[PDB]
Amino acid sequence: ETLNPSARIMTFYPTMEEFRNFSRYIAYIESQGAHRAGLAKVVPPKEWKPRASYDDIDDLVIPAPIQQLVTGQSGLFTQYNIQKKAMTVREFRKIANSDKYCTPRYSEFEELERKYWKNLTFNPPIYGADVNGTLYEKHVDEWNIGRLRTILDLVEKESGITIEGVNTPYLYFGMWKTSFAWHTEDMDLYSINYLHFGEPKSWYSVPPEHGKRLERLAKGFFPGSAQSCEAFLRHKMTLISPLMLKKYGIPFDKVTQEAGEFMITFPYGYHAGFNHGFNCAESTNFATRRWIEYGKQAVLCSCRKDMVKISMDVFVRKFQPERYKLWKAGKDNTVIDHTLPTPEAAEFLK
Ligand SMILES: O=C(O)c1ccnc(C(=O)O)c1
Ligand code: NI
Ligand SMILES: [Zn+2]
């Protein structure tokens, strides 16, 4: 509880030697208290690239682009998705850069941020979100989102189950004012986000240790949603402005991600944000030993079929054998300490 006492978003510039073992570097950033913010930025070494170029992708199909209709006022919004017809990246980029949807002119990011919160209910944009794929070359051995080699691999290993976007990669083609609503990951997992190219993506984050304060507040503002689902934030429809969070005393931080940067999110780290203009991001979830307890305790959406539920059985039997029978008989009373680094970080703590 002494590392990163302010729970602020940290940034890391590893060398190529530090960069190589993905799981070990996550254990390192946690030894530095990065997980306390819920969100960390890792800027990869200059010589690292995941792809020779992106010249060849115009013909790539976005099967289900989503028009984002936002309704609300005074810092509180609900985002509704309108599924559009499939389109090629070529088609998507022409719409993104057209006068009707392009990024407005601005000086500071604080200026663009005001325009985002002022305008998010007007001129609904299109997000090429949740596209099954990867833009990593097959030989890329470091921080390859298609194969991170974390203990999350036990899901597919033990059961054969693949969960799209969770243990497989997703691409996201943004335009100006496209959004991701406030959410934690499925099963309160970690996630990795790489911005392959284009305009920036801005992020807000609430520290895991304060996640419950955010839920209590969301539940107050959206009482119908709360009555009808145990975890409605997981619908990823709820936008809440940082001025509202400030007004109700929720600690949050912000950060802008540029092309070529990774963002890590941590178990129970609520995050939200928006794209600045035409870009492309890739992400997936992953786990460390610390996640197992979060997985066991995650409150899952109780109202949608096709919602992600992972069996924790394999993880408890393997990594917590002494609590297995207790947990099974429904008696495992463990309280999560959000400040604690993952066991794998021992190495870096003397
Ligand atoms: O679309 C995004 O940018 C984004 C960012 C962070 N997280 C998610 C998610 O679906 O968890 C989506
Ligand atoms: Ni996310
Ligand atoms: Zn639900």
CSV table of N, CA and C in Angstrom, one decimal, residues 72 87 112 120 133 140 154 174 184 191 262 306 346 348:
chain,number,residue,atom,x,y,z
A,72,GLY,N,-28.6,12.3,-23.8
A,72,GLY,CA,-28.3,12.7,-22.4
A,72,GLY,C,-28.0,14.1,-22.3
A,87,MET,N,-18.5,-2.7,-44.6
A,87,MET,CA,-17.7,-1.7,-45.4
A,87,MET,C,-16.3,-2.1,-45.3
A,112,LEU,N,-10.1,20.1,-27.5
A,112,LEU,CA,-10.7,19.0,-28.1
A,112,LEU,C,-11.6,18.2,-27.1
A,120,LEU,N,-21.0,15.4,-28.1
A,120,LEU,CA,-21.1,14.0,-28.3
A,120,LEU,C,-22.6,13.5,-28.7
A,133,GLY,N,-9.5,-9.8,-35.8
A,133,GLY,CA,-8.2,-9.8,-36.5
A,133,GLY,C,-7.1,-9.3,-35.7
A,140,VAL,N,6.5,-11.6,-35.2
A,140,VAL,CA,6.7,-10.6,-34.1
A,140,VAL,C,6.6,-11.4,-32.8
A,154,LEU,N,-4.9,-20.8,-20.2
A,154,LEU,CA,-5.5,-22.0,-19.6
A,154,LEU,C,-7.0,-22.2,-20.0
A,174,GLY,N,-11.4,3.8,-35.6
A,174,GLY,CA,-12.1,4.9,-35.0
A,174,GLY,C,-12.3,6.0,-36.0
A,184,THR,N,-15.3,-2.0,-16.8
A,184,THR,CA,-14.1,-2.9,-16.6
A,184,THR,C,-14.1,-4.0,-17.6
A,191,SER,N,-6.4,-5.8,-19.7
A,191,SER,CA,-6.4,-5.8,-21.2
A,191,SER,C,-5.2,-5.1,-21.7
A,262,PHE,N,1.2,1.4,-26.1
A,262,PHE,CA,0.3,0.4,-25.5
A,262,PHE,C,-0.3,1.1,-24.3
A,306,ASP,N,-25.3,-14.6,-24.4
A,306,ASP,CA,-24.0,-14.2,-25.1
A,306,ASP,C,-23.1,-13.3,-24.3
A,346,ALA,N,7.4,-10.4,-6.9
A,346,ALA,CA,8.4,-10.7,-5.8
A,346,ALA,C,9.8,-10.5,-6.2
A,348,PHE,N,11.1,-8.4,-8.2
A,348,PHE,CA,11.4,-7.0,-8.3
A,348,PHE,C,11.3,-6.3,-7.0
